[PDB]
Amino acid sequence: MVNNINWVKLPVILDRLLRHPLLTDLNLETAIQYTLDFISAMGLPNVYVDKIETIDIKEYRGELPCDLISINQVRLHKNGIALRAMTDNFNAYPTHGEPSFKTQGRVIFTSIKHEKVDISYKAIMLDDEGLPLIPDNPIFLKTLELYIKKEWFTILFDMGKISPAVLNNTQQEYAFKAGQCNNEFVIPSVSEMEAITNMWNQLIPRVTEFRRGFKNLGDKEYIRVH
Amino acid sequence: NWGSILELDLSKVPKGWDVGKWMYYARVNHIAVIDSFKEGTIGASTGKLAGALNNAGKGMIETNIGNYIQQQINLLEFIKMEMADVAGISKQREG
């Protein structure tokens, strides 16, 4: 992402929506859910605050933090080796290798019995209230306005309160601004193109960045003069 | 003379995937997992935008500077053959 994510509150999206005299019955309650549909459908990784947290694996299992959404990596605490993924079907089950993990709910099943692991994960950025905080980027705010507009105009169109060319224009204006907002949050900056320039341009390939914390992925590979 | 330049659109990189790590695992596997049902690609899929946003492949900045180089290489060969005739000191006489 080129721009920065300056956070603003959820009533910012209703300064913009209630300019429309057909959307005057939207609330903060409805803006809360239609924001959460929009963060997850887009799935842009810049909107999530990156947190790191250590748990204690009790017996091939540990609890998971209350604000988890998505795990970037899990690594061991003493060694530092990242745990890959559980491909086993019979993990904790004994009969008569490289470590691995699998997280379903609020529990993480590892292949190690009694250990500590650091989890680097992603959360929703909250507020002084317990409400999600949105970027003020007006490509994001405009298409978040159009998502709440499109899901409301769909409701009116099924009741018969909106012309079929009016939802068709709002579905068109969202479909451009949803692909424009996607590319705004995923195109690399000048500072992040060097981390791709040093990764791509390698005479001796580095193919084991996952054992580290993807730390040396952007490191320039220098070759001596002989 | 730099190479051909491939114009890459990253609108099909999956959700939550960093573009640094997506390309890194594409170097390795030679298999770049893409997301054709992303929310950004609702335009051509639903029919509200042009279909050229979900198809037609990638574009190339290619400049044929290599054909220009081979013309300069074949012109130096002709002159060096000419001057070897003017002096009367040919190639099999130099060798």
Partner: peptide
Amino acid sequence: TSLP
């Protein structure tokens, strides 16, 4: 309508 489609084909825009």
